[PDB]
Design a protein around this motif. Sequence first.
Motif, PDB file in Angstrom:
ATOM      1  N   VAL B  23      -9.077  22.212 -46.436  1.00 35.89           N
ATOM      2  CA  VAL B  23      -9.381  23.671 -46.371  1.00 35.89           C
ATOM      3  C   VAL B  23     -10.375  23.893 -45.226  1.00 35.89           C
ATOM      4  O   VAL B  23     -11.326  23.092 -45.104  1.00 35.89           O
ATOM      5  CB  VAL B  23      -9.933  24.198 -47.712  1.00 35.89           C
ATOM      6  CG1 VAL B  23     -10.278  25.679 -47.645  1.00 35.89           C
ATOM      7  CG2 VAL B  23      -8.977  23.932 -48.867  1.00 35.89           C
ATOM      8  N   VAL B  24     -10.156  24.937 -44.427  1.00 34.63           N
ATOM      9  CA  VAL B  24     -11.076  25.352 -43.328  1.00 34.63           C
ATOM     10  C   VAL B  24     -12.263  26.049 -43.989  1.00 34.63           C
ATOM     11  O   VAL B  24     -12.061  26.976 -44.769  1.00 34.63           O
ATOM     12  CB  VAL B  24     -10.375  26.265 -42.303  1.00 34.63           C
ATOM     13  CG1 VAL B  24     -11.295  26.623 -41.140  1.00 34.63           C
ATOM     14  CG2 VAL B  24      -9.076  25.663 -41.783  1.00 34.63           C
ATOM     15  N   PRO B  25     -13.523  25.612 -43.748  1.00 38.39           N
ATOM     16  CA  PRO B  25     -14.692  26.338 -44.246  1.00 38.39           C
ATOM     17  C   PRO B  25     -14.716  27.773 -43.701  1.00 38.39           C
ATOM     18  O   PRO B  25     -14.447  27.950 -42.527  1.00 38.39           O
ATOM     19  CB  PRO B  25     -15.889  25.514 -43.745  1.00 38.39           C
ATOM     20  CG  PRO B  25     -15.315  24.130 -43.519  1.00 38.39           C
ATOM     21  CD  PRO B  25     -13.900  24.380 -43.038  1.00 38.39           C
ATOM     22  N   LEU B  26     -15.031  28.746 -44.560  1.00 32.20           N
ATOM     23  CA  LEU B  26     -14.681  30.178 -44.348  1.00 32.20           C
ATOM     24  C   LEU B  26     -15.680  30.884 -43.425  1.00 32.20           C
ATOM     25  O   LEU B  26     -15.324  31.982 -42.962  1.00 32.20           O
ATOM     26  CB  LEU B  26     -14.559  30.890 -45.700  1.00 32.20           C
ATOM     27  CG  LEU B  26     -13.363  30.473 -46.557  1.00 32.20           C
ATOM     28  CD1 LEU B  26     -13.235  31.369 -47.777  1.00 32.20           C
ATOM     29  CD2 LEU B  26     -12.062  30.485 -45.761  1.00 32.20           C
ATOM     30  N   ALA B  27     -16.842  30.284 -43.131  1.00 31.93           N
ATOM     31  CA  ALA B  27     -17.817  30.798 -42.137  1.00 31.93           C
ATOM     32  C   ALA B  27     -17.156  30.892 -40.753  1.00 31.93           C
ATOM     33  O   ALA B  27     -17.507  31.820 -39.995  1.00 31.93           O
ATOM     34  CB  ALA B  27     -19.054  29.936 -42.100  1.00 31.93           C
ATOM     35  N   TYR B  29     -14.164  31.909 -40.113  1.00 28.91           N
ATOM     36  CA  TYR B  29     -13.307  33.124 -40.102  1.00 28.91           C
ATOM     37  C   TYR B  29     -14.130  34.417 -40.111  1.00 28.91           C
ATOM     38  O   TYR B  29     -13.508  35.487 -39.961  1.00 28.91           O
ATOM     39  CB  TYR B  29     -12.385  33.137 -41.321  1.00 28.91           C
ATOM     40  CG  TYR B  29     -11.289  32.107 -41.289  1.00 28.91           C
ATOM     41  CD1 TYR B  29     -10.118  32.334 -40.587  1.00 28.91           C
ATOM     42  CD2 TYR B  29     -11.419  30.910 -41.969  1.00 28.91           C
ATOM     43  CE1 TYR B  29      -9.105  31.391 -40.557  1.00 28.91           C
ATOM     44  CE2 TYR B  29     -10.416  29.956 -41.950  1.00 28.91           C
ATOM     45  CZ  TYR B  29      -9.253  30.195 -41.239  1.00 28.91           C
ATOM     46  OH  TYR B  29      -8.258  29.261 -41.219  1.00 28.91           O
ATOM     47  N   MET B  30     -15.452  34.339 -40.289  1.00 27.38           N
ATOM     48  CA  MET B  30     -16.318  35.523 -40.544  1.00 27.38           C
ATOM     49  C   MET B  30     -17.571  35.461 -39.661  1.00 27.38           C
ATOM     50  O   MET B  30     -18.676  35.768 -40.158  1.00 27.38           O
ATOM     51  CB  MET B  30     -16.696  35.603 -42.027  1.00 27.38           C
ATOM     52  CG  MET B  30     -17.398  34.361 -42.553  1.00 27.38           C
ATOM     53  SD  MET B  30     -17.544  34.342 -44.356  1.00 27.38           S
ATOM     54  CE  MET B  30     -18.456  35.867 -44.567  1.00 27.38           C
ATOM     55  N   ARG B  31     -17.397  35.113 -38.385  1.00 24.62           N
ATOM     56  CA  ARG B  31     -18.433  35.287 -37.335  1.00 24.62           C
ATOM     57  C   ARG B  31     -17.859  36.186 -36.238  1.00 24.62           C
ATOM     58  O   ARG B  31     -16.736  35.924 -35.774  1.00 24.62           O
ATOM     59  CB  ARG B  31     -18.941  33.944 -36.807  1.00 24.62           C
ATOM     60  CG  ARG B  31     -17.872  33.013 -36.258  1.00 24.62           C
ATOM     61  CD  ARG B  31     -18.460  31.635 -36.040  1.00 24.62           C
ATOM     62  NE  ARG B  31     -18.956  31.074 -37.293  1.00 24.62           N
ATOM     63  CZ  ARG B  31     -19.900  30.139 -37.412  1.00 24.62           C
ATOM     64  NH1 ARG B  31     -20.488  29.620 -36.345  1.00 24.62           N
ATOM     65  NH2 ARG B  31     -20.252  29.717 -38.614  1.00 24.62           N
ATOM     66  N   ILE B  32     -18.611  37.229 -35.886  1.00 25.75           N
ATOM     67  CA  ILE B  32     -18.179  38.330 -34.976  1.00 25.75           C
ATOM     68  C   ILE B  32     -18.141  37.814 -33.534  1.00 25.75           C
ATOM     69  O   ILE B  32     -19.109  37.152 -33.108  1.00 25.75           O
ATOM     70  CB  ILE B  32     -19.074  39.580 -35.138  1.00 25.75           C
ATOM     71  CG1 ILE B  32     -20.562  39.309 -34.872  1.00 25.75           C
ATOM     72  CG2 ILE B  32     -18.854  40.199 -36.511  1.00 25.75           C
ATOM     73  CD1 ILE B  32     -21.042  39.713 -33.493  1.00 25.75           C
ATOM     74  N   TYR B  33     -17.031  38.085 -32.840  1.00 29.83           N
ATOM     75  CA  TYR B  33     -16.835  37.861 -31.386  1.00 29.83           C
ATOM     76  C   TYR B  33     -16.666  39.223 -30.717  1.00 29.83           C
ATOM     77  O   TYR B  33     -15.753  39.969 -31.106  1.00 29.83           O
ATOM     78  CB  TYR B  33     -15.623  36.966 -31.128  1.00 29.83           C
ATOM     79  CG  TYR B  33     -15.725  35.614 -31.779  1.00 29.83           C
ATOM     80  CD1 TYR B  33     -16.398  34.570 -31.165  1.00 29.83           C
ATOM     81  CD2 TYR B  33     -15.178  35.390 -33.029  1.00 29.83           C
ATOM     82  CE1 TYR B  33     -16.512  33.328 -31.771  1.00 29.83           C
ATOM     83  CE2 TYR B  33     -15.282  34.155 -33.649  1.00 29.83           C
ATOM     84  CZ  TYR B  33     -15.952  33.119 -33.020  1.00 29.83           C
ATOM     85  OH  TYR B  33     -16.051  31.904 -33.637  1.00 29.83           O
ATOM     86  N   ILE B  92      -9.106  32.354 -34.228  1.00 25.11           N
ATOM     87  CA  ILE B  92     -10.583  32.191 -34.435  1.00 25.11           C
ATOM     88  C   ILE B  92     -10.935  30.707 -34.618  1.00 25.11           C
ATOM     89  O   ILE B  92     -11.980  30.297 -34.083  1.00 25.11           O
ATOM     90  CB  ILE B  92     -11.113  32.988 -35.647  1.00 25.11           C
ATOM     91  CG1 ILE B  92     -10.677  34.455 -35.681  1.00 25.11           C
ATOM     92  CG2 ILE B  92     -12.628  32.886 -35.714  1.00 25.11           C
ATOM     93  CD1 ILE B  92     -10.630  35.029 -37.087  1.00 25.11           C
ATOM     94  N   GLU B  93     -10.111  29.942 -35.347  1.00 27.71           N
ATOM     95  CA  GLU B  93     -10.474  28.604 -35.905  1.00 27.71           C
ATOM     96  C   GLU B  93     -10.516  27.546 -34.797  1.00 27.71           C
ATOM     97  O   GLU B  93     -11.095  26.470 -35.048  1.00 27.71           O
ATOM     98  CB  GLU B  93      -9.502  28.110 -36.979  1.00 27.71           C
ATOM     99  CG  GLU B  93      -8.978  29.190 -37.908  1.00 27.71           C
ATOM    100  CD  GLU B  93      -7.738  29.909 -37.404  1.00 27.71           C
ATOM    101  OE1 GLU B  93      -7.379  29.703 -36.224  1.00 27.71           O
ATOM    102  OE2 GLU B  93      -7.133  30.669 -38.184  1.00 27.71           O
TER     103      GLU B  93
ATOM    104  N   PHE C  18     -14.412  21.078 -51.853  1.00 27.40           N
ATOM    105  CA  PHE C  18     -15.555  22.028 -51.844  1.00 27.40           C
ATOM    106  C   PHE C  18     -16.142  22.103 -53.257  1.00 27.40           C
ATOM    107  O   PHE C  18     -15.369  21.980 -54.228  1.00 27.40           O
ATOM    108  CB  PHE C  18     -15.126  23.408 -51.335  1.00 27.40           C
ATOM    109  CG  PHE C  18     -14.696  23.491 -49.888  1.00 27.40           C
ATOM    110  CD1 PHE C  18     -14.970  22.477 -48.976  1.00 27.40           C
ATOM    111  CD2 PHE C  18     -14.038  24.622 -49.424  1.00 27.40           C
ATOM    112  CE1 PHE C  18     -14.572  22.583 -47.651  1.00 27.40           C
ATOM    113  CE2 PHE C  18     -13.643  24.727 -48.099  1.00 27.40           C
ATOM    114  CZ  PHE C  18     -13.911  23.708 -47.214  1.00 27.40           C
ATOM    115  N   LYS C  39     -11.063  40.704 -37.013  1.00 25.83           N
ATOM    116  CA  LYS C  39     -12.091  40.450 -35.965  1.00 25.83           C
ATOM    117  C   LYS C  39     -12.404  41.734 -35.184  1.00 25.83           C
ATOM    118  O   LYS C  39     -13.556  41.858 -34.727  1.00 25.83           O
ATOM    119  CB  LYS C  39     -11.641  39.327 -35.026  1.00 25.83           C
ATOM    120  CG  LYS C  39     -11.601  37.945 -35.660  1.00 25.83           C
ATOM    121  CD  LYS C  39     -12.970  37.369 -35.957  1.00 25.83           C
ATOM    122  CE  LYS C  39     -13.410  37.549 -37.393  1.00 25.83           C
ATOM    123  NZ  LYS C  39     -14.797  37.066 -37.593  1.00 25.83           N
TER     124      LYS C  39
END
Lengths: 170, 159, 293, 205, 56
Positions: B23-27, B29-33, B92-93, C18, C39
């Motif tokens: 699983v990709v850690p979800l932080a 997916y949720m940082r603004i560019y 994003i990833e 996790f 985004k």
Amino acid sequence: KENPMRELRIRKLCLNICVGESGDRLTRAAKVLEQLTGQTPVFSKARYTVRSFGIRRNEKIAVHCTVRGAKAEEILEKGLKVREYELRKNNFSDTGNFGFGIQEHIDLGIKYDPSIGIYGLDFYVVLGRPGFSIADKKRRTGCIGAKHRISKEEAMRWFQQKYDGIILPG
Amino acid sequence: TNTKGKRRGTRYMFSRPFRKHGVVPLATYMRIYKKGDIVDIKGMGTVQKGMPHKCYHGKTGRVYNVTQHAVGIVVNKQVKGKILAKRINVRIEHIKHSKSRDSFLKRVKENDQKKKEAKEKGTWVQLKRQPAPPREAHFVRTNGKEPELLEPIPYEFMA
Amino acid sequence: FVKVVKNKAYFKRYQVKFRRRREGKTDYYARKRLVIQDKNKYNTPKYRMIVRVTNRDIICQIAYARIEGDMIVCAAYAHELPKYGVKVGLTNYAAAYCTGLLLARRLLNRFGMDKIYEGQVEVTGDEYNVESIDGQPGAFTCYLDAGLARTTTGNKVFGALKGAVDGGLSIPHSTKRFPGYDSESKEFNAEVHRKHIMGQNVADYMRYLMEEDEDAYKKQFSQYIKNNVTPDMMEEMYKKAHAAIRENPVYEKKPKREVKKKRWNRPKMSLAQKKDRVAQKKASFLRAQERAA
Amino acid sequence: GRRPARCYRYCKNKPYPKSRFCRGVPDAKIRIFDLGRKKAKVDEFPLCGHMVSDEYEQLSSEALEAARICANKYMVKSCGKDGFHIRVRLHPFHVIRINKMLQTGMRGAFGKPQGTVARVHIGQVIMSIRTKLQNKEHVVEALRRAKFKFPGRQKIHISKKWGFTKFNADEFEDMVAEKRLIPDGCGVKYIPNRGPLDKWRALHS
Amino acid sequence: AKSKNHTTHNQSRKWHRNGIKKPRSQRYESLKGVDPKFLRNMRFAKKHNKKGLKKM
RNA sequence: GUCUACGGCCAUACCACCCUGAACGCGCCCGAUCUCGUCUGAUCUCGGAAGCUAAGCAGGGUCGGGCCUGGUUAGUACUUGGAUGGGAGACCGCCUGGGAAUACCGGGUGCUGUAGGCU
RNA sequence: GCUCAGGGAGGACAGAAACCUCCCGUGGAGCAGAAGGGCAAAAGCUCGCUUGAUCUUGAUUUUCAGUACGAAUACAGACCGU
RNA sequence: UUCUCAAACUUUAAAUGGGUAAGAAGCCCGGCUCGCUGGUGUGGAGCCGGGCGUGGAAUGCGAGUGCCUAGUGGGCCACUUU
């Protein structure tokens, strides 16, 4: 004083009539369980083609039925009376369950029929405890813990206490 | 000649690290560019969609376009003698922020601290990072005891 | 004797899931869809309505995910409900509605949208949708986090959904999973849903035991006998609650009493102690030989 | 039969092992990498003697096989059947290739497997002989007999270790005394201050 | 009549004669490739700047 | 002191076994009338509150395995740049800078955000 | 919604291999094919409904001359499925 | 436990290397626009108008830009890698 949440009981009674056969035999094998349990049993398919045994992949081999509660107790009394309340050491699994076969279903209380005939079937009793349903939740699952397990030793002294049954070697 | 092909030699590049699979850690997916955000590119293998090409792996561009799941990022791939600032659409990833610029944006503000302070007080501060100078003269004390003599050790074969 | 599956090599190679997957709580597949924003919204907060039915409680929270951990903007627990009327049966469909209703009304109070978006004042059971009003602030649009609960037709999560939807929250939904959805011929009998919302699923079962055998009635409904809840009272007992919630939804916090500070938990055994125990053990073992031999 | 060892002396190619890719490999001449009394306890064969490579080169399986025999014979003629233990501490894993010219030419010239060869580094053990401490001059002569079966330059070192263990011979008896070492066949198992304490109680029971 | 197949031998020397030009990084880059739904709105935002001229 | 709801980082959190859990919680647990789902109210869904911390859970333990972090290995291995250096070669030394990895020996054993409890 | 390969322990006929349970099970299976990567409340397994394999502008990536083709990536406008 | 290995093995893991950044297109207030995004003059972008020159690592060096264009498109050798 033992904690009353450690009361060892029967979780389920796993019956199966494995004939290695389709159609008429297997549907009249399901008659036996349905005249015994009062519920519609499931027809387990073949895993793959064994040519030696005379099966083929997904060809219906067997019919099986799991029973819970008062019905599970009442059938298991009929089974052990045919074995006159004696089982072997090696019939009891390390995980704290036991099982035994019967040669013919007439001995339980079903009368002989020309069409239905004779079918040997197979008792497997799944001994449990309050808090064994943790291991199959959708929410917070968990293993039962090393204390809460049924040992083969604990399962043997349960059978010896509950059904007043001797356990013999060989 | 080599097999031309999009994911050729990416056996280890686009692979996940050891015990950082799944699983990709979800932080992530949720940082603004934003536009003009300097961004480093690193093809994650778990998300096969919107991957960058292997030539942009370990490159740093700035963002010009921002969509739902992805950012258009201007990167300098160099072909032969020509360096071509070119525009790739990366999800994003396969992207982090770059901390390269962020040690300057503190130094900008730190210079703004040291400038407005003593614009009037008249203490001329240093705002240029002067290079690491030749270390100034100093006294090494030998506190009573002598310095230990070293001599080369004699040879003796080990195997 | 067969090869041990849990070697050193097993635990060396082993990658833990996790913490919230190990604990058996969070679905990270379903979370990644519900929590994260597009985004090209750029810290436009993406709200979700987190309904969690316990053994004894119903937790209805609203959170938006920040990078530090998602931040609960408003909470409404079902153990608050005696202050609004409902004494007992706190984890049933009718309490789920009240919990959902109390969440919605409490939140719309804090955004100053209390007078605007009243919602369903008189409870019907039909499909209501909180349309936005022009010249006013837009309706609070969050989504439904069902968690791990098998969303069958008539799951209690869809109680708190309807509870909040009626309370003036824009949540996208369908009536398919509301109780009273005819699965066979594919209609939605709204009257059956009103029964569950106003708690007549229970009241009809109370009467069913009360009329058959008082043995099974007392065992099943012990705290309904205790707190003086009769089946005839039932419908008004929730109408009084639904209206009392909407009158004063705001949360007066429980005041933090002075703590004497005693440590019920056992502290961590220090290195000196651990190192000394194995010294005492290897002395105890050698004077269990010198006395013996 | 097969070419001179002049042709396949120097570690020319990358290591090319018998694998899924390189198949149809002929069987190496050396198979018995240890003989003598290899059923001997640590305590009884202290004196270890290593033949050590002084050149980065390839040593043939057939040379290892020859030197294995040349040392075994002289050790049996000196120390008897069970007064020593040899280990050939090289395994011929690099595969040698042959471009059989029977009219093709250098066209499509990638060789078929001819044989195997042990890739040896500078200061790597080729063979080693553990025996009784009396049989010191016999080990030196046994390995010097076997030097003539290899190309390049080999040194004959006498280990400061106890037999075919990794513990020094001036240290060994002091570590078997405190049961930091316990004999376990030809080897000795190191017992740290790190296990569960029930392991330690079995030590001092 | 086999010949040389590929080389990159003199090429790095050839590239550096007229320099390896970093792209003419001019100010105000084009809005080509910026998403249409956003570029639509930005064009409307420019269209109605006349509206708030007195206020500004 | 600590929990629950939702998390962030994803073993210093895992794994095995043992020990202790005040209160609130969380659970196992009692049922199938309703909604729903089954061969089977075990799962799933639903309605509860007689019982108990047995278990999950939390904390703690273990000269625990693992993991994290240092030491050692080691200025070792390899290595940029240099020489009309050595050597028949194989390869090696030096100059100029950079610089690892096991075995082995220590130490550590979840932090923590928002909301709501309990003491 | 489920968990797999494989293993251990049991169970009439039943044996090395049919079926039935319980336990261990980091993926050691599987994902049409070559190999690599990726993958566990899934991307696998089993079911339910379906036709986003549709209609349409541009931009971009890959090979690259920074041309086509093929293949691909992010959008946008439709109409749709779940 | 022990011996020995891997171009098409790998937990670790260099040296050399490859991006990017090292300011006025920057920082900093303040207002305006929007049909985009919306619990919220929220979010984002775009515009105007102000005020901030200690020009924000070393070293060296004047740069930028466009036309037209020949010859070439057999190469070969050397250190190190292969």
